Amino acid sequence: NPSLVIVSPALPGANNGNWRTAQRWKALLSPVCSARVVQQWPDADASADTVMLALHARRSAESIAHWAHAHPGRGLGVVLTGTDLYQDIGSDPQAQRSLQLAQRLVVLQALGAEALPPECRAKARVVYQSTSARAELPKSARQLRAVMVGHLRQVKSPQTLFDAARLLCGREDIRIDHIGDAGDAGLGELARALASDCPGYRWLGALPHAQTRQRIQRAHVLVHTSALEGGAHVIMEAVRSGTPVLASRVPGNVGMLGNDYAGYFPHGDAAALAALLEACRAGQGSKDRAAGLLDSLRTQCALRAPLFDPRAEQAALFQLLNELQP
Ligand SMILES: O=c1ccn([C@@H]2O[C@H](COP(=O)(O)OP(=O)(O)O[C@H]3O[C@H](CO)[C@@H](O)[C@H](O)[C@H]3O)[C@@H](O)[C@H]2O)c(=O)[nH]1
């Protein structure tokens, strides 16, 4: 059986996407190979590795190079997690070199290969991520509770959420919970000042993943404003909890929710987001109502939900492994 090494830049045990992906892939591939996760390669155990899957064409570029030089033409998959595909590979030589050296390039939703140079598309492979489902909860019509989840950095465009919450500062019937570490400098100060001014907006800080999944499950709607995504875990998690999504219309989000999804706003457009939230609120009512925006979005998200089934991610990873060690 193959001996797979997964390279993740994330600090071990970190509560973020890069660590989550590596540990989940390890678990899904364990029945057909010996799999391990490292932050860099090689290490003492490198001689027995036969396949490498490396997350982020730039952050892992050094381990990717080490593998490519030790195993030219063989065994290397490079996973495009987001800022590499939608930023770095434009002009970062390290990210560009990882694209050339790889035997396969993994993108995390169907649109990802459009951002690759055309000479890299033949070796590109789509692997939708997966997450465990949660029962869809019945929810009250008395208030609209929205949540957004993302450690604060500029690529998450949290200012769109700040500005839309400000536009709704007077609305007692709408609540916005914001989950995520302070991160990029100054953004935490913006969240704190906004929560002090507008009681409907709460910045909860970073929360353990278990509690975050529960809050996504409880919310009426998840908002995601990012300038770019590889394929966001939190959108998956909402969809697989029966919670519909309002998302910025950028390729990483569109690949997750579908070209026909009715819950997009243009990136950076806080008034558009605020108006979608108002429409979600306006549509709320009793079991004897019909045809609210939230209900149309729930119907659409339910059609997306099978994309994020772990048995499906596993089968695609099995195929990927077979291609990297035939
Ligand atoms: O306070 C917090 C903040 C985050 N999360 C979790 O963090 C995870 C990962 O978040 P995600 O939405 O995927 O964002 P990133 O961490 O930025 O992940 C990056 O990398 C992933 C691949 O590893 C891609 O799928 C994403 O698009 C890309 O943004 C999710 O499971 C969240 O529930 C928490 O539990 N608590």
Author numbering: 3 to 328
What do the authors say?
The bacterial SEN biosynthesis gene cluster encodes three proteins, SenA, SenB, and SenC. In contrast to other types of GTs, SenB performs dual functions in two-step catalytic reactions, catalyzing the formation of C–Se glycosidic bonds and the subsequent cleavage of Se-P bonds to generate the final product.
To elucidate the structural basis leading to substrate recognition and the catalytic mechanism of SenB, we solved the structures of SenB complexed with various sugar donors, including the ternary complex SenB/UDP-Glc/PO43- (1.95 Å) and two binary complexes, SenB/UDP-GlcNAc (1.88 Å) and SenB/UDP-GalNAc (1.64 Å). However, a nearly complete loss of catalytic activity was observed for the K158A mutant, suggesting that the hydrogen bond on K158’s proton abstraction has a subtle influence and underscoring the significance of K158 for the enzymatic activity of SenB. Moreover, in the SenB/UDP-Glc/PO43- complex structure, K158 forms a stable water-mediated bridge with PO43-, a phenomenon also observed between SeP and K258 in SelA6. Thus, the Se-P bond cleavage mediated by K158 in SenB may begin with the amino side chain of K158, which captures a proton from a water molecule.
